[PDB]
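Following up on my earlier message about chloride ion. Here are the inputs again, as you asked, copied directly from the submission form:
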Amino acid sequence: ATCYCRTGRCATRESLSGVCEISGRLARLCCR
Amino acid sequence: ATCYCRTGRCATRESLSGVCEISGRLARLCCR
Amino acid sequence: ATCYCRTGRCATRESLSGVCEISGRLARLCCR
Amino acid sequence: ATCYCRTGRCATRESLSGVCEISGRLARLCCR
Amino acid sequence: ATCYCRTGRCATRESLSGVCEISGRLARLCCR
Amino acid sequence: ATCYCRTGRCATRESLSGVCEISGRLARLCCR
Ligand SMILES: [Ca+2]
Ligand SMILES: [Ca+2]
Ligand SMILES: [Cl-]
Ligand SMILES: [Cl-]
Ligand SMILES: [Cl-]
Ligand SMILES: [Cl-]
Ligand SMILES: [Cl-]
Ligand SMILES: [Cl-]
Ligand SMILES: [Cl-]
Ligand SMILES: [Cl-]
Ligand SMILES: [Cl-]
Ligand SMILES: [Cl-]
Ligand SMILES: [Cl-]
Ligand SMILES: [Cl-]
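Thanks, got it. Here's what our run produced:
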């Protein structure tokens, strides 16, 4: 899948699919 | 990025980049 | 705080504040 | 529910109900 | 270290040191 | 079990058994 680690909400075509980190803080894994 | 939720270790060209789930069980997020 | 374990995105006045579970599956913790 | 991000164990009226963060470190989410 | 995935609070000589799973459900990792 | 918070892959003797933290970053919990 195509995934991004997001500070904001996932894109419309993406789904919250797990957890990643941004500077040691839990972030959204958004995949499609 | 291109990522996969994995039952085994990440491929040689992938890196463990977060946490996902397979059937409600914690799994490796592997991204190339 | 007042928080909920959500299947969908956090409400307008809520913020994604952590990780909880619904039936053993990762879910958004949303707090107002 | 009523939840707090705790450094110590949950109160007797509270139950550990998820994971939150305190300065990028994992902490107990205690809810009642 | 010597650690256990626990359904209850960590023992008095143990410390909550991470997150594990019991039957796909989040649980305290308690380490001596 | 015998567990360690790992930056690299788990030893072949060990199994990835959950999540811990190394300086506020998610690390492999490797147990045996
Ligand atoms: Ca789970
Ligand atoms: Ca962290
Ligand atoms: Cl983003
Ligand atoms: Cl979603
Ligand atoms: Cl998150
Ligand atoms: Cl796999
Ligand atoms: Cl998690
Ligand atoms: Cl909801
Ligand atoms: Cl506290
Ligand atoms: Cl925790
Ligand atoms: Cl226990
Ligand atoms: Cl926990
Ligand atoms: Cl054992
Ligand atoms: Cl290591």
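One observation from looking it over: Chains B and D do not touch (no CB pair under 8 Å). Hope that helps, and feel free to reply on this thread.
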